[PDB]
Amino acid sequence: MGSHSMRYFYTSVSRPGRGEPRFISVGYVDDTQFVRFDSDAASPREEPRAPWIEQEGPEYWDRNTQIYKAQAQTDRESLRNLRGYYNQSEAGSHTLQSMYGCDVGPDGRLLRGHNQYAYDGKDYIALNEDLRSWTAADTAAQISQRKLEAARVAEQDRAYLEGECVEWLRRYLENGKDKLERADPPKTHVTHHPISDHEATLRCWALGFYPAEITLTWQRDGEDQTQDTELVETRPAGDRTFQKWTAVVVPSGEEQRYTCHVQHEGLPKPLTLRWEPS
Amino acid sequence: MIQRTPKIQVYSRHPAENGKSNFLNCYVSGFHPSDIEVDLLKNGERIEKVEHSDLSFSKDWSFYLLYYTEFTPTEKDEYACRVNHVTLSQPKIVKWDRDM
Amino acid sequence: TPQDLNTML
């Protein structure tokens, strides 16, 4: 767990009566977006979305643009095929999502590769962890499996995941080193708001942290609480960092029995916080 | 199409301080399909310069987007996010609370 | 860099 990942996320959406399907891709290293492409843009091109990628030459942007354009066309055929496999009408909108990439350890070695697909938000077919075989969700996906085996796609995906995917991720980690291999710890505080004259809300905050993975837990007398607690989804601040909070409703006068425990990669040691009344 | 309705959080980039420039965020997540309409409101009125992140999705295939605009909070001005999606009967409004 | 395959289902 000085580990890193590269992921690409492709979204193709049909829109009958409103043109051909839109294709969008984005690429990430860990929680940092670095590229996009949108087939609806005035002139569709792979575009940089982080400072460290801007140095890549015109050959990089041109090649990758060509790749997304080819993939957009092929997703359109996939979408037509999938509509037939499920005996669906021409009138409805459908989504084909793709997500793929590689995970590496501290040393740059491949830990795991991924290449999978969803249709209308439901798992459809996935390259297994072996990078040689597929898991299909239903009889429709079994047809896609048969086509993928005939074209020997798993072999080619294995070669991309073990090769280019890891070599490029290593390159990005070195070029964006100052941000991508920096953990920013959370800045924390606990607030207190009376609800009634017999209960109060304690809210434990974490701000300014990177990467997004964090755990915030409230204990009462040192036992984890999930009762009378609210925990919001980790959310982006817009300056690359993340935010999260967890709250618990407590009996007035019992605040000192409650502690907020914070774990993050940026922290040498987990924190234990309490509310401190001014 | 089983669909999923968006989760909605409204918040600021930095802790709010009256009279200090900041960014107002509306984070919509957990939704499917991907078409969504999001507005940021000041005193019930639509804010014009609003940007958003590029479409991405989570491990469970649900979409997420961040909408944001520059703003200077005051004691009196009210801010909110208004969201529409196929999953909602009418648009949903979530008011900005500076302690949430 | 993205995969240079254009895989059809």
Numbering used by the authors:
A (entry chain A): 0 to 277
B (entry chain B): 0 to 99
C (entry chain C): 1 to 9
Copy out sentences from the published article reporting this entry, exactly as the authors wrote them:
Cognate T-cell receptors (TCRs) expressed on CD8+ T-cells detect pathogen-derived peptides presented by HLAI molecules on the surface of infected cells. In this study we focus on two HIV-1-specific epitopes and their presentation by 4 different members of the HLA-B7 superfamily, HLA-B*07:02, HLA-B*42:01, HLA-B*42:02 and HLA-B*81:01. We show that single polymorphisms between different alleles of the HLA-B7 superfamily can induce a conformational switch in peptide conformation that is associated with differential HLAI-specific escape mutation and immune control.
To explore this notion, we first solved the atomic structures of HLA-B*07:02, HLA-B*42:01 and HLA-B*81:01 with TL9-p24. Although peptide positions 1–4 and 8–9 were in similar orientations in both HLA-B*07:02-TL9, HLA-B*42:01-TL9 and HLA-B*81:01-TL9 structures, residues 5–7 in the HLA-B*81:01-TL9 structure, which differs in the peptide-presentation platform by just 4 and 3 residues compared to HLA-B*07:02 and HLA-B*42:01, respectively, were flipped into the opposite orientation. HLA-B*07:02 and HLA-B*42:01 have Trp at position 147, whereas HLA-B*81:01 has Leu147. This side chain had a substantial impact on the position of the α2 helix of the HLAI, evident by a movement of 1.7 Å towards the peptide for HLA-B*81:01, and altered the interaction between the HLAI and the C-terminus of the TL9-p24 peptide. The altered position of peptide residue Gln3 in HLA-B*81:01, compared to that in HLA-B*07:02 and HLA-B*42:01, forced Asn6 to swing up, out and clear of Gln3 in HLA-B*81:01. The smaller side chain of Leu156 in HLA-B*81:01 compared to the longer Arg156 in HLA-B*07:02 and Asp156 in HLA-B*42:01, enabled peptide residues Leu5 and Thr7 to form interactions stabilizing Asn6 in the flipped orientation in the HLA-B*81:01 structure. Overall, therefore, the altered network of contacts between the TL9-p24 peptide and the polymorphic residues in HLA-B*81:01, compared to those of HLA-B*07:02 and HLA-B*42:01, resulted in the upward display of different residues within the solvent exposed, central peptide bulge. Taken together, these data demonstrate that, from the perspective of the TCR, TL9-p24 ‘looks’ completely different in the context of HLA-B*81:01 than it does in the context of HLA-B*07:02 or HLA-B*42:01.
